[PDB]
Design an enzyme around this catalytic site. Structure first.
Site, PDB file in Angstrom:
ATOM      1  N   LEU A  26       0.793  -1.216   0.000  1.00  0.00           N
ATOM      2  CA  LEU A  26       0.000   0.000   0.000  1.00  0.00           C
ATOM      3  C   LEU A  26       0.834   1.279   0.000  1.00  0.00           C
ATOM      4  O   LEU A  26       0.270   2.322  -0.301  1.00  0.00           O
ATOM      5  CB  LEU A  26      -0.949   0.021   1.214  1.00  0.00           C
ATOM      6  N   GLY A  27       2.125   1.222   0.356  1.00  0.00           N
ATOM      7  CA  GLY A  27       3.031   2.368   0.215  1.00  0.00           C
ATOM      8  C   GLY A  27       4.093   2.543   1.292  1.00  0.00           C
ATOM      9  O   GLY A  27       4.060   1.884   2.333  1.00  0.00           O
ATOM     10  N   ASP A  52      -2.677  16.712  12.159  1.00  0.00           N
ATOM     11  CA  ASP A  52      -2.280  16.379  10.800  1.00  0.00           C
ATOM     12  C   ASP A  52      -3.493  16.155   9.907  1.00  0.00           C
ATOM     13  O   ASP A  52      -3.413  15.344   8.977  1.00  0.00           O
ATOM     14  CB  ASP A  52      -1.366  15.154  10.851  1.00  0.00           C
ATOM     15  N   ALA A  87       7.156   3.932   7.878  1.00  0.00           N
ATOM     16  CA  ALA A  87       6.590   2.607   7.790  1.00  0.00           C
ATOM     17  C   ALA A  87       6.527   2.099   6.357  1.00  0.00           C
ATOM     18  O   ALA A  87       6.560   2.883   5.414  1.00  0.00           O
ATOM     19  CB  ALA A  87       5.189   2.648   8.374  1.00  0.00           C
ATOM     20  N   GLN A 115       8.393   8.038   5.559  1.00  0.00           N
ATOM     21  CA  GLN A 115       9.474   8.222   6.535  1.00  0.00           C
ATOM     22  C   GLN A 115       8.932   7.774   7.906  1.00  0.00           C
ATOM     23  O   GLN A 115       8.883   8.530   8.895  1.00  0.00           O
ATOM     24  CB  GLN A 115       9.997   9.679   6.541  1.00  0.00           C
TER      25      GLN A 115
HETATM   26  C1  YNK Z   1      -4.927   5.209  -1.986  1.00  0.00           C
HETATM   27  C2  YNK Z   1      -5.630   4.493  -0.827  1.00  0.00           C
HETATM   28  C3  YNK Z   1      -7.151   4.682  -0.954  1.00  0.00           C
HETATM   29  C4  YNK Z   1      -5.248   3.007  -0.776  1.00  0.00           C
HETATM   30  C5  YNK Z   1      -5.871   2.317   0.409  1.00  0.00           C
HETATM   31  C6  YNK Z   1      -5.393   2.962   1.705  1.00  0.00           C
HETATM   32  N1  YNK Z   1      -5.988   2.290   2.832  1.00  0.00           N
HETATM   33  C7  YNK Z   1      -5.501   2.386   4.065  1.00  0.00           C
HETATM   34  N2  YNK Z   1      -6.187   1.783   5.050  1.00  0.00           N
HETATM   35  C8  YNK Z   1      -5.690   1.910   6.268  1.00  0.00           C
HETATM   36  C9  YNK Z   1      -4.541   2.603   6.533  1.00  0.00           C
HETATM   37  C10 YNK Z   1      -4.081   2.699   7.974  1.00  0.00           C
HETATM   38  F1  YNK Z   1      -4.164   3.940   8.434  1.00  0.00           F
HETATM   39  F2  YNK Z   1      -4.812   1.947   8.795  1.00  0.00           F
HETATM   40  F3  YNK Z   1      -2.816   2.323   8.132  1.00  0.00           F
HETATM   41  C11 YNK Z   1      -3.887   3.209   5.448  1.00  0.00           C
HETATM   42  C12 YNK Z   1      -2.653   4.007   5.534  1.00  0.00           C
HETATM   43  C13 YNK Z   1      -2.378   4.883   6.552  1.00  0.00           C
HETATM   44  N3  YNK Z   1      -1.180   5.480   6.291  1.00  0.00           N
HETATM   45  C14 YNK Z   1      -0.699   5.013   5.088  1.00  0.00           C
HETATM   46  C15 YNK Z   1       0.483   5.311   4.422  1.00  0.00           C
HETATM   47  P1  YNK Z   1       1.626   6.526   5.125  1.00  0.00           P
HETATM   48  C16 YNK Z   1       3.288   5.819   5.144  1.00  0.00           C
HETATM   49  C17 YNK Z   1       1.621   7.906   3.987  1.00  0.00           C
HETATM   50  O1  YNK Z   1       1.201   6.887   6.494  1.00  0.00           O
HETATM   51  C18 YNK Z   1       0.711   4.709   3.178  1.00  0.00           C
HETATM   52  C19 YNK Z   1       1.932   4.989   2.465  1.00  0.00           C
HETATM   53  N4  YNK Z   1       2.901   5.212   1.901  1.00  0.00           N
HETATM   54  C20 YNK Z   1      -0.196   3.772   2.678  1.00  0.00           C
HETATM   55  C21 YNK Z   1      -1.358   3.479   3.371  1.00  0.00           C
HETATM   56  C22 YNK Z   1      -1.624   4.111   4.580  1.00  0.00           C
HETATM   57  N5  YNK Z   1      -4.369   3.085   4.218  1.00  0.00           N
HETATM   58  C23 YNK Z   1      -5.715   4.455   1.718  1.00  0.00           C
HETATM   59  N6  YNK Z   1      -5.189   5.123   0.496  1.00  0.00           N
END
Ligand code: YNK
Length: 282
Positions: free
Chosen positions: A9-10, A114, A15, A13
């Site tokens: 998912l990504g 944030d 995780a 700085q």
């Molecule tokens: C583009 C989309 C819609 C695709 C699904 C994603 N669904 C999701 N569900 C729960 C969480 C949580 F919050 F539960 F983790 C997170 C998340 C929270 N911080 C993240 C980060 P960062 C490192 C920017 O904080 C990155 C990076 N890279 C990637 C994902 C998350 N995402 C949300 N965006």
């Protein structure tokens, strides 16, 4: 291991984040594999329980893994997606979830610090949850969101502050829902104050009494500012007063999450969209 690692998912700085399946309940989750932005998403979220706050479901060691609800989409995706039109009712529903989440936060003496569209997450059933509690802190703790959502006190380097920091950010989110572009895209800290005062008017010691005694206060150009019925030309008066309330310069005059939810806009027609009928990207 407990989880079936589905998708990447990504990366940031902090995780590496991952979509995964809980191998004994078959529930889809999100795992944040990573000190002080980590130990204080646990310190705050295993504590808290609200529908419009992301849940911390499990955690372990050696990298720390933090297992939250998986949300399919977020408010930045909805904003950016041209196939979706936002009716007055979808916006009221996004704002009402965002505010009910923050009012519980602020009642538990926590500042998120944030709030942006991309940290307002949205599960398949259209429940908005606040996420990314790695910058959050208690009202008590001793001493700051991305520049476009940042309040003017913080840009003038305010050392102590409160609710208003999160409430200014909510207003910037509301403007971006209505305009579908960022409201105040500063290219720098000084440009950010230029854009604020060119949009909303350069304030006075009446609008903001202790403004001239902030640590980084500096004499800006006077600007009259645009009236909010010009920028938000389709908005009704009930909604224009919500905006006007969240963008007051004086942080103590600035409307709280509770005062926002007590405004007529939230009891007026058309009431908010059911979760299940909120617009859906692919
Ligand atoms: C583009 C989309 C819609 C695709 C699904 C994603 N669904 C999701 N569900 C729960 C969480 C949580 F919050 F539960 F983790 C997170 C998340 C929270 N911080 C993240 C980060 P960062 C490192 C920017 O904080 C990155 C990076 N890279 C990637 C994902 C998350 N995402 C949300 N965006």
């Amino acid at each position: 291991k407990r989880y079936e690692k589905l998708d990447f998912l990504g990366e940031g700085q902090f995780a590496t984040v991952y979509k995964a399946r809980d191998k004994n309940t078959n529930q889809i989750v999100a795992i944040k594999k990573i000190n002080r932005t980590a130990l204080r998403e646990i310190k705050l979220l295993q504590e808290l329980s609200h529908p419009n706050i992301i849940g911390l479901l499990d955690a372990f060691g050696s990298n720390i893994s933090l297992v939250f609800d998986f949300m399919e989409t977020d408010l930045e995706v909805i904003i950016k997606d041209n196939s979706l039109v936002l009716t007055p009712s979808h916006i009221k529903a996004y704002m009402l979830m965002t505010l009910q989440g923050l009012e519980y936060l602020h009642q538990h003496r926590i500042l998120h610090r944030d709030l942006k569209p991309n940290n307002l997450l949205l599960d398949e059933n259209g429940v908005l949850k606040l996420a990314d509690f790695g910058l959050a802190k208690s009202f008590g703790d001793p001493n700051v969101v991305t520049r476009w959502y940042r309040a003017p006190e913080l840009l003038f380097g305010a050392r102590m502050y409160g609710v208003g920091v999160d409430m200014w950010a909510v207003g910037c989110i509301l403007a971006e829902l209505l305009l579908r572009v960022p409201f105040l895209p500063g290219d720098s800290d000084l440009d950010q104050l230029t854009r604020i005062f060119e949009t909303l008017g350069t304030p006075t010691e009446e609008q903001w009494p202790d403004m001239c005694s902030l640590p980084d206060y500096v004499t800006f150009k006077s600007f009259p500012g645009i009236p909010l019925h010009h920028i938000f030309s389709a908005a009704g008066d009930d909604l224009l007063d919500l905006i006007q309330g969240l963008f007051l310069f004086n942080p103590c005059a600035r409307i709280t999450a509770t005062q926002a939810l007590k405004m007529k806009y939230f009891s007026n027609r058309p009431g908010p969209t059911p979760g299940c009928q909120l617009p859906r990207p692919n």
